[PDB]
Design a protein around this ligand. Structure first.
Ligand code: NAP
Ligand code: NAP
Ligand code: 8KG
Ligand code: 8KG
Lengths: 265, 265
């Protein structure tokens, strides 16, 4: 199937980490598509600014809920308030991440605990809290990851862990949903370097690599999620999907089901 | 290069989850090899029994420290007491896991936090706490994972997440160690279905597949770790390493280093 921006006309969509970066570019894109949007981040001020440009762009409705995804209760509550506000949920975009600086891992157990709580746990809390509305609407989940969630690079050990943890968790859910004949899709978005101000500031004096436009990235995420693709690759190199694709895993995963007692699902 | 049991004669080795299963079989194997051993699990009684058979088998010294790896302070303290007790550390075997039952994921969030703390966080705490002794001894770390830490299967979503999180974290550490010319090796052990009573009980009425011997598994883990192999695959099928090997990732990981400022190391 080929994408049409009409696929998101009047659809109820949640976007995390929407104050800046890819989250913001996705909000703007959904707006132009005529969708109902609910945004989140910590900065109330930041959210207000994008929520204003959202309606200005063509959003069917635009609202925001400020808060920290470090707090699991907020993550669960944000989903319910947003579900009420839009009268259901069609697409859930899981984008937010806690601050990460590129440094060779020395210690800081609490930094690693924060990373897994924000980057990983909140995503499971939020997806669990959203799954009934998504079940009704036969909707989707966009799980934002990176190349570092499919492969290893130095100076991002806790970050890689959180992104790998998502792959394990959500790919399992995706299979479970499929085998229990539930039409809710899970789209894992594997991204390369994106030209967001935050990344550029963080790689300055460490990584040489060329970034990709945040506008084209955001659109590709929405496109793939709506087109109900299991995984979406967006990087400067055209070999990234061939190299990171893991067909062997796909084969292995398929035959695993053969050993299961069919009564289980 | 080929393995010789003399490679572990007089070596100071830590084993987690040593009261039963693969942990226990590894303790016994190290004992027969003439190594100094320190074991852990929650059951004081269980540990005593294996620590007795350990000396009886030929262990250079055998000690135990009971406790829950759910407690991050214990995890770091266990490593220091054990380091004192053996007068250093050569090999650190990270084996323990919190209880997991095969069920399609619903809403047990506190159980996911539990799985991530035990199965993943304690491993990072313990490896961080052990790394200086390992740096001095030019030693190794054995990170016990499964096929489910390289690929996806239904009914083990939080478990897969924790095992994928280890892959991301430790493979990063391995690269960091290598680039900073530190001779401490990280061996990720990817295992298939093993003859442990615990596994056998958990798959009953869900998975009908052939298990592998816990004795040959444990030995293969010690063998690979000592031979300083990056990853060790142990499963009934001989195609499991070709299928789960991910050469594309290996390629990608190498070229990533090209974009880094070498002086940062
Ligand atoms: N940028 C890249 O080059 C790149 C590359 C590959 C993959 N990715 C993935 O793309 C996604 C988006 O990245 P980005 O470039 O948009 O990054 P970004 O500019 O740093 O955006 C992060 C967003 O999350 C919010 N946030 C941060 N901490 C939070 C917390 N504690 N609770 C709630 N919200 C929080 C931020 O707002 P507040 O600070 O106001 O809270 C912001 O809106 C991430 O999942 C990232 O892993 C990015
Ligand atoms: N068995 C298989 O078929 C299989 C297959 C693939 C991979 N693996 C991997 O192999 C490793 C060993 O598995 P196994 O078969 O030996 O399992 P097992 O028989 O269940 O052993 C688990 C061990 O961890 C200890 N433990 C459990 N909860 C703990 C906690 N809260 N704090 C500290 N220690 C705790 C247990 O002792 P206490 O209960 O007394 O605390 C026991 O000694 C695991 O990492 C597993 O992922 C196993
Ligand atoms: O995931 C990202 C982008 C980031 C990064 C940038 C270079 C190297 C590792 C991580 C940026 C810096 C940190 C970690 C992570 C996420 C964001 C932006 C965070 O601020 N990449 C690019 C690579 O291909 C996968
Ligand atoms: O990791 C394991 C063994 C276990 C399992 C058993 C079948 C399916 C999934 C998980 C056993 C049951 C649970 C989860 C996990 C670890 C142990 C033993 C735990 O008690 N496998 C075998 C597969 O190839 C990877």
């Amino acid at each position: 199937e080929e994408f049409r921006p009409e696929m998101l006309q009047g659809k109820k969509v949640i976007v995390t980490g929407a104050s800046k970066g890819i989250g913001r570019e996705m909000a703007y894109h959904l707006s132009k598509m005529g969708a109902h949007v609910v945004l989140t981040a910590r900065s109330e001020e930041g959210l207000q600014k994008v929520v204003s440009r959202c309606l200005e762009l063509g959003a069917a409705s635009a609202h925001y809920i400020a808060g920290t995804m470090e707090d699991m209760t907020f993550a669960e509550q944000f989903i319910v308030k947003a579900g009420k506000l839009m009268g259901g949920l069609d697409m859930l975009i899981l984008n937010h991440i806690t601050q990460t600086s590129l440094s060779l891992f020395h210690d800081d157990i609490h930094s690693v605990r924060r990373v897994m709580e924000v980057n990983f746990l909140s995503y499971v809390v939020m997806s669990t809290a959203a799954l009934p509305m998504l079940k009704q609407s036969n909707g989707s989940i966009a799980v934002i990851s990176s190349l570092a969630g499919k492969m290893t690079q130095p100076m991002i050990a806790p970050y890689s862990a959180s992104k790998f943890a998502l792959d394990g968790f959500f790919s399992t859910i995706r299979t479970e949903l499929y085998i229990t004949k539930v039409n809710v899709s899970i789209t894992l978005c594997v991204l390369g370097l994106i030209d967001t101000e935050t990344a550029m500031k963080e790689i300055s004096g460490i990584i040489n690599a060329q970034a990709s436009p945040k506008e084209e990235c955001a659109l590709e995420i929405i496109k793939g999620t709506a087109l109900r693709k299991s995984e979406v690759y967006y990087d400067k190199s055209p070999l990234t999907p061939i190299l990171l694709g893991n067909p062997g895993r796909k084969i292995m995963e398929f035959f695993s089901l053969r050993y299961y007692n069919k009564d289980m699902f």
